[PDB]
Design a protein around this ligand. Structure first.
Ligand code: HEM
Ligand SMILES: N#Cc1ccc([C@H]2CCc3cncn32)c(F)c1
Length: 464
């Protein structure tokens, strides 16, 4: 009356666990993971076993079932390389690394000031200032050239834009990074994140009983990077903590400001989540920005459509920047499209707390279930012509097809801060510049814990 199949009758990935661990040892990474999975899905179907009890799915069909099984305490897998550092230095873990009742406790005291629509209305104007400074700075340099255009690799400037906006919205501090040269503090922070991501892949696929002695140099490499990260994050904390102890302001001065004033969370559990918000707000946000710019340069037909929208609502957004979330549907659709093809978050994890059925297969509890978004977003059955950058496919309205930020109570905490940074930067670049490129070959994607472009194209910014 439904049909359920044995778990042991699942299509099995041909690989051998141990050899892939030795391949990662040798290659110092797993850059082509998204491709090896996409291929396997094409050979075995929309579900298969992979003892790297792990099950890999790809259909919105399955995400919905996975949220139905989400308990009151959804459970992702512990990320030991990250947790190890937290306890080596006697730190508390944030929402990204917690599970069970402690996670629910932190999460419910963070949602109001980090994710709610009322909080977005307060920090969104602050993001807008940074986005306007980004284009104002870019326009000054552009109109200095004879052809009123600047051609460059924008990945540095964009990454320093996301550090600016994130620090302003989190701590209410303004660091001279947009319109000015990078500081050694930021360049060291970005390099630590790069190494923290690299070394994570080298250690996350083998238990600590092996990586301890086969790759101890990497563990050192890994903890050093975190130290540099906790250094940058904690200097942001120590500044705002001392600044608030002497005056409790009456206006909005950032997110972490409210979290400290409320004091619903212990000091160590604010520092913990304040680390995860400072650290996970740079790469994950900046790379979809770059790909959005890239895809618009490849499709000027789509670009001008977005520029028209953004030029019309330009006035009502300068009056109240909050309107950007509702006056720029096409640009919000473009962002949905970028993440469909270039999902910085490759997969969603759930250790199911209860039996379930996927693709008419029995899934026991305690099983790890990974949703592989790279193939989910490329399944022609659900996305007609998935090879095409078509923002208008999201405007019609199809509910679990857009899950780059996860689902359930666990869904991304910074979801709306990221959307505002991406949206507001693209809105002010579209109404002042044209983004053009000769580079029209697809950009190869790399897996270093996140899915990111292995190359950054040359982009021209021509002014209007
Ligand atoms: C395009 C940008 C981003 C994408 C695609 C993304 C993706 C994701 C995904 C897939 C998850 C897992 C959720 C789940 O498994 O249910 C997640 C969780 C999380 N993200 Fe984001 N993220 C982005 C930006 C950010 C930003 C900017 C921040 C902080 C400022 C952030 C902080 C977090 C945290 C703390 C969690 C853990 C939430 C929890 O476990 O309850 N992310 N994100
Ligand atoms: N501490 C810390 C921390 C937490 C999260 C991220 C990124 C990686 C994947 C993801 C999804 N949302 C944000 N992130 C990070 F880089 C550092």
């Amino acid at each position: 009356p439904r049909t359920v199949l044995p778990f042991e009758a699942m299509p099995q990935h041909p690989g051998n666990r141990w050899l892939r661990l030795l391949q990662i040892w040798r290659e110092q990474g797993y850059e082509h993971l998204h491709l090896e999975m996409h291929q396997t899905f094409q050979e075995l179907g929309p579900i298969f076993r992979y003892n790297l009890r792990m099950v890999c799915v790809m259909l919105p069909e399955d995400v919905e079932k996975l949220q139905q099984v989400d308990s009151l305490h959804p459970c992702r897998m512990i990320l030991e390389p990250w947790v190890a550092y937290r306890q080596h230095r006697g730190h508390k873990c944030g929402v990204f690394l917690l599970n069970g009742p402690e996670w629910r406790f932190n999460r419910l005291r963070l949602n109001p000031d980090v994710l709610s629509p009322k909080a977005v209305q307060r920090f969104l104007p602050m993001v807008d200032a940074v986005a306007r400074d980004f284009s104002q700075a870019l326009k000054k340099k552009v109109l200095q050239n004879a052809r009123g255009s600047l051609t460059l690799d924008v990945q540095p400037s964009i990454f320093h834009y996301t550090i600016e906006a994130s620090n302003l919205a989190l701590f209410g501090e303004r660091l001279g990074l947009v319109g000015h040269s990078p500081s050694s503090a930021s360049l060291n922070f970005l390099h630590a994140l790069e190494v923290m991501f690299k070394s994570t892949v080298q250690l996350m696929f083998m238990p600590r009983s092996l990586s301890r002695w086969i790759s101890p140099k990497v563990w050192k490499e890994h903890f050093e990077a975190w130290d540099c990260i906790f250094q940058y994050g904690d200097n942001c904390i120590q500044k705002i903590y001392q600044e608030l102890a002497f005056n409790r302001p009456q206006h909005y001065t950032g997110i972490v400001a409210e979290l400290l004033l409320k004091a619903e969370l212990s000091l160590e559990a604010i520092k913990a989540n304040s680390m995860e918000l400072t650290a996970g707000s740079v790469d994950t946000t900046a790379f979809p920005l770059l790909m959005t710019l890239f895809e618009l340069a490849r499709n000027p037909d789509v670009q001008q459509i977005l520029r028209q929208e953004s030029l019309a609502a330009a006035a009502s957004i300068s009056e109240h920047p909050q309107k950007a979330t509702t006056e720029l549907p096409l640009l919000r659709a473009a962002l949905k499209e970028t993440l469909r093809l270039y999902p910085v978050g490759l997969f969603l994890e759930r250790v199911v707390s209860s039996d379930l059925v996927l693709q008419n297969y029995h899934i026991p509890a305690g099983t790890l279930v990974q949703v592989f978004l790279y193939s989910l977003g490329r399944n022609a059955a659900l996305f007609p012509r998935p090879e095409r950058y078509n923002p208008q496919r999201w405007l019609d309205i199809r509910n679990f097809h857009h899950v780059p930020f996860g689902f359930g109570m666990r869904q991304c905490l910074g979801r709306r801060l990221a959307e505002a940074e991406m949206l507001l930067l693209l809105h002010h670049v579209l109404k002042h510049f044209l983004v053009e490129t000769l580079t029209q070959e697809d950009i190869k994607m790399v897996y270093s814990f996140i899915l990111r472009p292995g190359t950054s194209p040359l982009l021209t910014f021509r002014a209007i």
